[PDB]
Design a protein around this nucleic acid. Structure first.
Ligand SMILES: [Zn+2]
Length: 87
RNA sequence: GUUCUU
């Protein structure tokens, strides 16, 4: 039974490859607004889970952003609305 | 492939 809340003004970014970095994602997403955070999710040992979230200070149309074809280092980012489920 | 993280 579907869970979580849709986070406003935030985009899920999956398919983040080890050859990529936060800075190029940050710089790209500035085309849509003032980026608040590029937050890559890691495990407890600091190992990337290969996805993260880009949030904005301004209102963005997430539906439109997730249509974008954004490639880095030979790989296409996998975009979606950001959903937050329940140290 | 949906977030502990001022
Ligand atoms: Zn903590």
């Amino acid at each position: 039974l579907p869970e979580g809340k849709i986070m406003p003004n935030t985009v899920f970014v999956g398919g983040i490859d080890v050859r990529m970095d936060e800075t190029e994602i940050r710089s790209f997403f500035a085309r849509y607004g003032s980026v608040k955070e590029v937050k890559i999710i890691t495990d407890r040992t600091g190992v990337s889970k290969g996805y993260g979230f880009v949030s904005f200070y301004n209102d963005v149309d997430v539906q439109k952003i997730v249509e974008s074809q954004i490639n880095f280092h030979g790989k296409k980012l996998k975009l979606g609305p950001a959903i937050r489920k329940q140290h």
